[PDB]
Write a protein that binds this DNA or RNA. Structure first.
Ligand SMILES: *OCCCCCCNc1c(NCCOCCO[C@H]2O[C@H](CO)[C@@H](O)[C@H](O)[C@@H]2O)c(=O)c1=O
Ligand SMILES: *OCCCCCCNc1c(NCCOCCO[C@H]2O[C@H](CO)[C@@H](O)[C@H](O)[C@@H]2O)c(=O)c1=O
Ligand SMILES: *OCCCCCCNc1c(NCCOCCO[C@H]2O[C@H](CO)[C@@H](O)[C@H](O)[C@@H]2O)c(=O)c1=O
Ligand SMILES: *OCCCCCCNc1c(NCCOCCO[C@H]2O[C@H](CO)[C@@H](O)[C@H](O)[C@@H]2O)c(=O)c1=O
Ligand SMILES: [Ca+2]
Ligand SMILES: [Ca+2]
Ligand SMILES: [Ca+2]
Ligand SMILES: [Ca+2]
Ligand SMILES: [Mn+2]
Ligand SMILES: [Mn+2]
Ligand SMILES: [Mn+2]
Ligand SMILES: [Mn+2]
Lengths: 231, 232, 232, 231
DNA sequence: AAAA
DNA sequence: TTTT
DNA sequence: AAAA
DNA sequence: TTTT
C-alpha cells in the first residue's frame, strides 16, 4: 500500500484502535496506532498552530501545537526516515470526519526542506479558487475566504460527517539521500476546528508519503485519510 | 501553441532572424527575435552566472550574466507579464545545438517567487542527482554526471554533440501574477559552463517561463533554442 | 550632516515645503521635498502595509502602500544609491507629530538585502519585545505595548501626543552597494496603524536608509518626520 | 566572567584538560572541558564544512563537520540554553594557536534564528576589507582573498603561534524567550586549516555568548579564545 | 466527556 | 563558412 | 602521533 | 485652520 509518516491532530478518542481517552497529538509510522501521543486541549473555534521538525543528525520527529494564551502540546519520536520512507516523497495535510464532524479549515501552510546544499520552500497564507501547486484529493477545496477546507462544509457553513480530504504539494521533495551530510524539514500550518456538536471528529494530520499516494478507500473517521486499516 | 518568455544566452548569431552579429543576451517574448539584446563576451570553458529579476511594480524584466573578474552584460525590457503569460506557469532552462555545438552544462539553479493578494515558492539546486524527481527533463537533458544538469548530449569525454535540444522544468507550477494582487516578484540564478573545441560555439541557453504543459516544440534544435516552433 | 534616503508615508500636507495638498507617499533623497509623490488614500485606524524595493540593475527605488480590499498607491524614482549613500548603512522606521497628532504604530517589519561581488542579511519582526536589543530606539520610540513598535508617544488609552519624534534602526549595518559587485537588492515590508481622533492627522511614517551613526536631527518633529534637520 | 556555549573543532589534544588523545569536535558549556566529544579526522589544507543546529523542542545541540569524499564527524548534547545563556546573545567564530600553529581561515559563515514568528538570517560567502556587520576581536582580519583569518598569518602566508582572534555578528540575537512556542538556530561555516608543521594547533569554534563578550586575556592555545581558565 |  |  |  |  502507500507508505505514510504523519503527525496527527486527533480530536476524537478511538480506544478500539489504541488512541488515549482524550484528544491527543501523535506520531504515526505506517500505522494509525500512534508510536507516541500527548494530551492536546483542542479549543473549539479558535485558530491554532502546528510546527513539525526533523533532521538527519538527531533523526527525531517532533511537533508542537499551540493556541493563543494557553500551554502548548508537544510529542517527539526517534525514527530514521531512511528506514521508513522512500528518498522521494510528497508532503500533505489530511483531515476526516465520521459519525461526528468538524470544520478542518487550514488558513496557512509553509514547508522548508534542506539537503547537503539543495533547498525547497513554499508558504501558503492564502489559497486561490484553483491552486495548481496543490493536488486536492477527495473532499478538499480552495477559494472559500482564501482557506483550504479539507472536509466537506455545506453552503450553510455546517460541517459534514463521513468526509475525507487531503492536499499534497505538487513537487516531490528529496527527504533523505544515502551519500548526504545534513537533511532537515520544517512544517507550519494554522487550522480552525469548529463543531456545533459536543463531539468533534476526527482531526488533521501533516503527512509525508510516496509521491503517488491516494486517499485509501473508506479512510473516513478514525483513519484520518491516511490508513486503509487500523493496524 | 506554447506561450514563452525567456532570457536567451545566445552564443551563435543567426542574422536570418534578427540576432546581432555577436554572441548576445536578450529578452524573448513569444518570439526568438529578441525584444532587446546586448553584447555578451562569452568565455569558452569558463563557469559563468546569470541573474533574472522582475516585479509587478516596475513590470521590468532584467538579466545580468557574469564571469569571474570581468565586466558583466545586462539587458532590460518593460513588459506586463499579466498581459503575456497565464497566471500559472512552469519555469525551466532550455539549451540547443545545430550544425555547430557546445556543452550546455548547468551547475546550479535557484528560483524565488513571492505574491501578496504573502504566498512564496523557493528552490535551489547546487547539485543534481541521477533521478531528480522535482525536475521534468525534456529531450536530451540528463542528471547525475558529476552532479550537473546536461541540457544537450555530451559524449563520455565531455565532447558536445550537434543537433541536440533539451530542457529542465521545475515540477510544481508557479503563481507568477494575480489580478487581485499588491506585489509579485521572481528572481532566478543559474551557473553554466559553455565549452566548444574551436571558436565557433552554438546555440545557447535560456531561462524560460511557459504554460505548465510546455514541451520542446518540434524541430526546435539550433537557432530556436528549444523554445519556439518557428522563427517569427 | 546625516545622508538620508526614505519612503515617506506623509499624512499632513505641508505646502511651505512642496508637499501636494493631499496625504501622499513619496521618495525623499537627502531632502524632505520628495523627488516624487503620489496620492495616498490613508484610512484612519485601518492596519495598512508598505513594500519598498530596489536593485543595482534597474537602480529604481519603488514603494507600494495598501489597505485591505482597496486600491493601493505606488511611487517610483530612478536613483543610483552608489552615488547617494555610503556603502555601509543602517535601516530604520521614523515617525513624527507636531501641532496635529496620530498613533505611529508598527505591527511588523521585515528586511532582506542580497549582494554578489552571495552575501545576505534578513530580519523579520512580527512581534516586538519589552527590550528589543537588535533595535536601536531613538527619541520617543518604545516596544512591549501589545508586542508593537510605537514610534511616537501614546497615552495609556492609546491617545496620540503632538510634538513627538521617534525612530527604530536595525542594530547591524547593511552592505547596500559595492563598487566590484554584480547584483545588489533590498526589499522592506512593514504594517502600520495610523489613528487620530478628528480627520486632521499628522505627520507620518518613513522607511529610511542612513549613515550607520544617524540620529534624530535636532527639532525634526512635525513636517521633518525625524529625518531632516531643515526643509531644504 | 563571559557566559559561553561553543562547538569546538579542537585539532590539538590537550590531555592535561580532558581532551581525548585525538583531534576531536566537542560541545563546550561554560568550560573548555567539552561536555561531549567525537573523533575528528581533520584534513591538512582541505576545505571542510561545519553545521551546528538546536531547537527549543528537543533542546539538543548537535554539530556535523565534513570534508569532500570522507565520512563526517557528529556530536550531540541535550542542554536547555534557557538555563545556560541570557535571552539576548551575540554569535561568533573563535580560533587560537599556541606552541603549535595553523591557518584558521573561514571562507563562508551563515546563521539563521527563528523565534515564535521573528527571524534573523545572515550569510557571508565573501568577507570585505572593512566588514562593519562583524566585530573583529584580537588577531582576526578580513580582505585577504575575501576570507576571514581568525589567527595571525605573516605576509609570507606562514601561520603564527600564540595567536587568538574572534568574529562576532554585530546584531544581538534573541536565542530563547520564557513565553515562546518554538525557537531554532542553524549555523554553517567552511574552514581551511593548514600547517606546514606535523603538529597543527589549536582549532576553531562556533560560539554563542553574552553580547559584550571579549577575548579572555591569555586565552591563546588550548583555551581557543573562549575561556579564561581550563575548569 | 458525561451519564448509566 | 558557404553562397550570391 | 611517534619515539623513548 | 489662521493669516493675508
Ligand atoms: O473527552 C473526549 C470526548 C469525545 C467523546 C466521547 C466518546 N463518545 C462516544 C463513543 N465512543 C466510541 C467511538 O466509536 C464510535 C464512533 O465511530 C464513528 O465515529 C467516529 C467519529 O466521527 C469515527 O472516528 C469512526 O470512524 C466512526 O465513523 C460513542 O459511541 C459515543 O457516543
Ligand atoms: O571557419 C569559421 C567558422 C565560423 C562560423 C561561421 C558562422 N556563420 C555565420 C552566420 N550565418 C550563417 C549561420 O548558419 C549556420 C547554419 O545553421 C545551422 O547551424 C546553427 C548552429 O548550430 C544553427 O543555429 C542553425 O539552426 C542550423 O542548425 C553569421 O552571421 C556568421 O558568422
Ligand atoms: O478645522 C479643520 C482643521 C484641518 C487642518 C488644516 C491644516 N492646514 C493646512 C495647511 N497648511 C498649514 C499647516 O501648518 C500647520 C502648522 O504646522 C505644525 O503642525 C504640523 C502638524 O503636526 C507640522 O507638520 C508642523 O511641523 C508644525 O508642527 C494645508 O495645506 C492645510 O490643509
Ligand atoms: O594525534 C595527535 C597529534 C598531536 C601531537 C601530539 C602531542 N605532542 C606533544 C605534546 N603534548 C602536550 C601538550 O601540551 C604542550 C603544548 O602546549 C602549548 O601548545 C599547545 C599547542 O599550540 C597549546 O594548546 C597550549 O596552550 C600551549 O601553548 C608536547 O609537549 C608535544 O610535543
Ligand atoms: Ca481518533
Ligand atoms: Ca542564435
Ligand atoms: Ca508633510
Ligand atoms: Ca585542545
Ligand atoms: Mn489517534
Ligand atoms: Mn539571439
Ligand atoms: Mn511629503
Ligand atoms: Mn578539546
Amino acid at each position: 500500500a502507500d507508505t505514510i509518516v504523519a503527525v496527527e491532530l486527533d480530536t476524537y478518542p478511538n480506544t478500539d484502535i489504541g488512541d488515549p481517552s482524550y484528544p491527543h497529538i501523535g506520531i504515526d509510522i505506517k500505522s494509525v496506532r500512534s508510536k507516541k501521543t500527548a494530551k492536546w486541549n483542542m479549543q473549539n473555534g479558535k485558530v491554532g498552530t502546528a510546527h513539525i521538525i526533523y533532521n538527519s543528525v538527531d533523526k527525531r520527529l517532533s511537533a508542537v501545537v499551540s493556541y493563543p494564551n494557553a500551554d502548548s502540546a508537544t510529542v517527539s519520536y526517534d525514527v530514521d526516515l531512511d528506514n521508513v520512507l522512500p528518498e522521494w516523497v510528497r508532503v500533505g495535510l489530511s483531515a476526516s470526519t465520521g459519525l461526528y464532524k468538524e470544520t478542518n479549515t487550514i488558513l496557512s501552510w509553509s514547508f522548508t526542506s534542506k539537503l547537503k546544499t539543495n533547498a525547497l520552500h513554499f508558504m501558503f497564507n492564502q489559497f486561490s479558487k484553483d491552486q495548481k501547486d496543490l493536488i486536492l484529493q477527495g473532499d478538499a477545496t480552495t477559494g472559500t475566504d482564501g482557506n483550504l477546507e479539507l472536509t466537506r462544509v455545506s453552503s450553510n457553513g455546517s460541517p459534514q460527517g463521513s468526509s475525507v480530504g487531503r492536499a499534497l504539494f505538487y513537487a516531490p521533495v528529496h527527504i533523505w539521500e544515502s551519500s548526504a551530510v545534513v537533511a532537515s524539514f520544517e512544517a507550519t500550518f494554522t487550522f480552525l476546528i469548529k463543531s456545533p456538536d459536543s463531539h468533534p471528529a476526527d482531526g488533521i494530520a501533516f503527512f509525508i508519503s510516496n509521491i503517488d499516494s491516494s486517499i485509501p478507500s473508506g479512510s473516513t473517521g478514525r483513519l484520518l485519510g491516511l490508513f486503509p486499516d487500523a493496524n
